[PDB]
Structures are given as C-alpha cells and as structure tokens.
Copies of this chain bind each other. A is one copy, B any other.
Amino acid sequence: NSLNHLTSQLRQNFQAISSSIQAIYDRLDPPQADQQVDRLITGRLAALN
C-alpha cells in the first residue's frame, strides 16, 4: 500500500500549472517557472515524509 500511495502522489499538481516539470519550463520563462516548480518540490518532499 505504501508504494502505490507514494507513486500516485506524483499525479498531484499542488496548485502548480502542471504536474510535469518539463511542461512548466516549456510554457514559461525560467524566472517564472521556478516559483511554479517549487510547489512540486515541497509537495513531493511531504509525500516522501
């Protein structure tokens, strides 16, 4: 159960524009993408916790 829960957390957006990081640097300039990607980093660190 722990692995299926952990892997399914990668679908979450965490109020980001996209759940795929490459889809963020493709859409926005690098300065704007960092403040969007940061939500994916924090949300997925909490998933590991």
Contacts and interface: CB of A to CB of B under 8 A. Distances in A.
Nearest to A46: B46
Interface in A1-38: 12, 14-15, 38
Contact of A15 (B12, B39, B46): B39
Contacts of A39: 15
Max chain B Cβ within 10 angstroms of own Cβ: one of A12, A15, A39, A46: A15
A22 B46 CA distance: 26
Contacts of A12: 42
A42 B47 CA distance: 12
A37 to B, nearest CB: 12
Interface of A: 12, 14-15, 38-39, 42, 46
